[PDB]
Amino acid sequence: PKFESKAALLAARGPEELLCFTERLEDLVCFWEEAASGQYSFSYQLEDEPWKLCRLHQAPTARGAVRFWCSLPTADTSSFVPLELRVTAASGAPRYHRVIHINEVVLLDAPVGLVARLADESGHVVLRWLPPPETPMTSHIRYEVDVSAGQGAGSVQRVEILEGRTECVLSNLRGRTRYTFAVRARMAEPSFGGFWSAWSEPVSLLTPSD
Amino acid sequence: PKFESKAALLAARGPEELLCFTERLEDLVCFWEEAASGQYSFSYQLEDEPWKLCRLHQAPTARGAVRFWCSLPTADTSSFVPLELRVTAASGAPRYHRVIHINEVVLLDAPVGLVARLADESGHVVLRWLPPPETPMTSHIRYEVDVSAGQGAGSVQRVEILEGRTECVLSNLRGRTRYTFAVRARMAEPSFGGFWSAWSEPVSLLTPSD
Amino acid sequence: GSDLGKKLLEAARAGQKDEVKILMENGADVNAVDAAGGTPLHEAARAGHAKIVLLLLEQGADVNAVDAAGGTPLHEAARAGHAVIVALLLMHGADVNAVDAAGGTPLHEAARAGHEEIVILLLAMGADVNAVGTPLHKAARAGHLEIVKVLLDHGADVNATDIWDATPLHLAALIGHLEIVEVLLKNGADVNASDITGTTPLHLAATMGHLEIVEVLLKYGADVNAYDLNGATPLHLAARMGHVEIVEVLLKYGADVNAQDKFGKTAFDISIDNGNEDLAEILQAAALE
Amino acid sequence: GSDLGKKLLEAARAGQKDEVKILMENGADVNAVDAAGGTPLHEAARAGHAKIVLLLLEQGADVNAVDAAGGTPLHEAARAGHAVIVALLLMHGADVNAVDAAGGTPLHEAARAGHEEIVILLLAMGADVNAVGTPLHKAARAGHLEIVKVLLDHGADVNATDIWDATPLHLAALIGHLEIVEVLLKNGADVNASDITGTTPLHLAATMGHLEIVEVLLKYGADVNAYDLNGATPLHLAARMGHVEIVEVLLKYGADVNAQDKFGKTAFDISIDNGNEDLAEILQAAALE
């Protein structure tokens, strides 16, 4: 579903790597994709608890690429701690061995509910939006605003929004111009790491005459 | 000398009280003044050391007022600590008993070396000065700038300067006006307490035409 | 001690963990002494370097070594507020009630400096709550509220007196530490204890202009008309200092307006002598009653 | 326990110092237990309230009480990082090497959580540096550099192996903790130790793309052409992951370009399979030599 979007974003970042991520800090899926040769064992150790296993799911994709993934229980999703993972073949050869932190692999949903408004003075625009729905730690989410204009202007402005702030003020814009706005989200440092969310639903505005 | 200035400032604040102060954090004088009846004993205890005495000096002043004062040694001038003082008569009656902190009674010399300059735009003035000479903790000294104008304008502006900053920018001024500037100094909180220094040497400027 | 020994005093002071280990591995004398008869243990306790303190005690460093001022590393660690090191030292048998030339125990220094945890740690290992140069005097003076709470819970003498006849309540009253005065009073501090000068806590509070403290003392039964060696009541002292509000609170609790000191002066006399309009008006009214 | 007993469990948890004293003065059972078999001592150690911990131990609280998970207050205080309380508990005889259902000692928890001072304090009171569920594994994994330093100074096994055949150097290598790898190597960590999968530290470093670590390992004599159960050399792993710089560093130290894994694949084969321009150019050059 919405899962497929994020899996594709990551695959382009690190092909044939072991990509793990969290959507809402309350779960975790690790996955990889490979060619022609579950014939694999997924084991993990979490902070002072013995080594456990995870049910691998096998499904196809792309050009002959098989995607294996594991969904860890909500029981073992406490954050801020080393989580050791091992993928070992049937044959007993190693395949992957990582140490990640749960908190350091956050890929949130896109922000929603964009509302763009003109300022009382020409050239200024007020943008508001909503955090990714049903996400905790709204205070630690930082956003980036993209300002495009049509007709081969492309991306003109790229504005980082402070943590927890769902409000953006734009200036320095040309009057009488149809600009298009989107925002993405990411978890702020150093408590959390990860990638930018997919870009939000766009809204457009026509700036007044100057 | 310069001592007399500060003694007079304090006496007006608290008549018949036991006033102690430090000029440069490296000494201490306690003093009081009284009417018709050293016939007094000055003792002090400092932080975990036994009770010691101090040589009282007697000199006259004002309307029949005798001023007794004691200059503690530089040995017993370490700061940030309770310093217990007792003034006891010859007769053995109590007279004063205070607990002060050395750091909490700082009366610095006036700032010096005033330099007033016009800004590139009308109405703005740049003031610079020097910390009280031969004082430590220049970083913890805060200043206040007084802006007077002649001809019964009196004091128009009173501007606090941040700690350690010997620079002041003034705006909101009338053009074509002869304004007069002075600055005083004080020790910033919460590390230090005390009174405002005497006001500095004045410099004047005539603002440009607007 | 050895040439490496003073190099070790150099390195201990500097907090140079690597270098300390280097010099010791070369056979440095762990109990080398400087000009002040300080050991590397003294220096490491002063700077609060945990690992140096570990390496020294593991190599037989003298836990109760004394410098020329009578100070043990436990004294310096308590004074400098290095809780862990105080712990390490205590576990290795540091003397909780060793005393410096000045009669100071670690509990003395920890209480004066306001190191809460160290005072706790010292008390748990059996520090004498009522030793010489009383901790409660210093804590009361300094306004370490929580420390005064811990002191009292651990059984400190509420009415201990120094060389002046002053109790902790005298010091608390004087400095205007209201809560501390509260805590003291509820643990049975004598509200009308007198120093040798004939001063009660109420006298101090009235003189310094501590209005609420004056009220708290009065509620607990402080003598409104107690006299010092001047024959001065709180009302005399309040008058001299021009404390209007305090005069009113004194009046509420039954102050004698026409009490005469050993000069024969009333509070009203004092008001005229100081040209105090406000006091003279209220005292004049009170005198006619 | 008593009705006041659970009120005491209420109050201990809440850190309510006044209320704790109130309930105890009323005759509350100091060793009352909750649903989890936790005592007020557990709760007070967890929240880090010094004075409650004082009042409990002074009233005979069980220093080594165990909840249903095998946890002593020393475990919780070490886990929560309350240094003072750990000290208080230790002075009162808390068991340094008591173990929870999971085989965890306080030293295990303190090392994993990165509480430097507590690890020091535990070690000084004789915690077993090489007990079960090795602290060095966790410290290495987590990147607690100073803790790894303290562990090694106190004689921790540099080449201890878990259930996988993994040593601390394996974990340090994998996570890209360069200094830790340095410290480990200088204390005699086996550079060519193999887990059961035939992986050496160099294998991990090459695979994760940790260039400098690969260099440090190589300087200390790591086998450039060691093979895992795939018959894969570091150069195979580097190739698959597209690590150009690492391939060059491998080449510098004598890597076999035409080593074939159990698929018969060379690093160059891998490069063509991934369409890696950069690797194919450099590997092609190396193959002709």
UniProtKB/Swiss-Prot annotation, chains A, B:
Job description of the protein: Receptor for erythropoietin, which mediates erythropoietin-induced erythroblast proliferation and differentiation. Upon EPO stimulation, EPOR dimerizes triggering the JAK2/STAT5 signaling cascade. In some cell types, can also activate STAT1 and STAT3. May also activate the LYN tyrosine kinase.
GO molecular function: erythropoietin receptor activity; identical protein binding
Outcome of swapping R128A: Little effect on EPO binding
Extracellular side: 1-210
Organism of origin: Homo sapiens
Site features described as Required for ligand binding, chain residue numbers: F80
Subunit structure comment from the entry: Forms homodimers on EPO stimulation. The tyrosine-phosphorylated form interacts with several SH2 domain-containing proteins including LYN, the adapter protein SH2B2, PTPN6, PTPN11, JAK2, PI3 kinases, STAT5A/B, SOCS3, CRKL. Interacts with INPP5D/SHIP1. SH2B2 binding inhibits the JAK-STAT signaling. Interacts with RHEX; this interaction occurs in a erythropoietin (EPO)-dependent manner. Interacts with ATXN2L.
Keywords associated with the record: Cell membrane, Congenital erythrocytosis, Disease variant, Disulfide bond, Glycoprotein, Isopeptide bond, Membrane, Phosphoprotein, Receptor, Secreted, Signal, Transmembrane, Transmembrane helix, Ubl conjugation
Recorded disease: Erythrocytosis, familial, 1: An autosomal dominant disorder characterized by elevated hemoglobin and hematocrit, hypersensitivity of erythroid progenitors to erythropoietin, erythropoietin low serum levels, and no increase in platelets nor leukocytes. It has a relatively benign course and does not progress to leukemia.
Protein name: Erythropoietin receptor
Free-text note regarding domains: The WSXWS motif appears to be necessary for proper protein folding and thereby efficient intracellular transport and cell-surface receptor binding.
Glycosylation, residue list: Q39
Motif (WSXWS motif): 196-200
Effect of F80 to A/L: Greatly reduced EPO binding
Entry keyword annotation includes Ubl conjugation: yes
Tissues and organs where the protein is expressed, per its UniProt entry: Erythroid cells and erythroid progenitor cells.
Annotated localization: Cell membrane
Any one Gene Ontology BP term: brain development
Mutagenesis or variant effect for V81A: 16-fold reduction in EPO binding
Effect of S139A: 16-fold reduction in EPO binding
S-S bridge residues: C20-C30, C54-C70
Stated consequence of mutating F80W: 60-fold reduction in EPO binding
GO CC annotation terms, alphabetical: external side of plasma membrane; extracellular region; nuclear speck; plasma membrane
Claim: Zinc is one of the keywords in the record: no
